[PDB]
């Protein structure tokens, strides 16, 4: 279905899908993707993360392992 | 590690972790989702609550934020 | 007719109907497979296994054995 | 993928699939055919049946409808 797939903290690797949506209600942030589904996914290897930039969105971001 | 991450009512965003488990001690809930590490994390934005169901499992639920 | 056709920690061989059902009442598990007709059958030689995901559905799942 | 496709006493056509395998994880049985890809299929309309030979190993058959 749609929606989130990931939880914050979670390690993820490269094609890793992190977002589900119709729409852009989570853009693209640091090592993450965004096929024309608007799908959300994992540049990298890493940790998944998400912040609130509030009137920029919320954003979603991959950290490298190392 | 293990265990409730979150307390009745808390206030928790798309993504947060709920409750961290080996196995589906506590069970995915409205709005909640679960890893493959069974790991129970929020969909969208909203508050945690806790519901026991006796025999039927204890849900953690994410009442939509108001 | 339908219904479940094994119990909870029931041993059992590769091809063993495990439920018959109209839908996904249960869902295929670990070595469990699914027919046309939503039967679940064992995948493996094991033992029978209920798991309770909530919002996520009711699996069932063979644990190999040995 | 590979695996077990029918469950016991299952209604198959002439060459449907009964299982996928590298090796011969199963034998042939009556009315059961195997390609050079070791993959198991029905020769005949009926019903598939599991024998456990042990030892002997462990076999796939289609008994005629009628």
Same mark, same amino acid.
């Given at each position: 279905? %749609?929606?989130? *797939?990931? +939880?914050?903290? &979670?390690?993820?690797?490269? $094609?890793?899908? !992190?977002?589900? &949506? /119709?729409?852009? /209600?989570? *853009?693209?942030? *640091?090592?993450?993707?965004? $096929?024309?589904?608007?799908? %959300?996914?994992? %540049?990298?290897?890493?940790?998944?993360?998400? &912040?609130? /930039?509030?009137? %920029?969105? /919320? +954003?979603?971001?991959?950290?490298? !392992?190392?």
């Amino acid at each position: 279905r %749609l929606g989130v *797939k990931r +939880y914050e903290g &979670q390690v993820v690797r490269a $094609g890793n899908i !992190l977002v589900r &949506q /119709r729409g852009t /209600r989570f *853009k693209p942030g *640091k090592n993450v993707g965004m $096929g024309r589904d608007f799908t %959300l996914f994992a %540049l990298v290897d890493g940790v998944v993360e998400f &912040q609130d /930039r509030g009137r %920029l969105g /919320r +954003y979603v971001h991959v950290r490298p !392992l190392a």
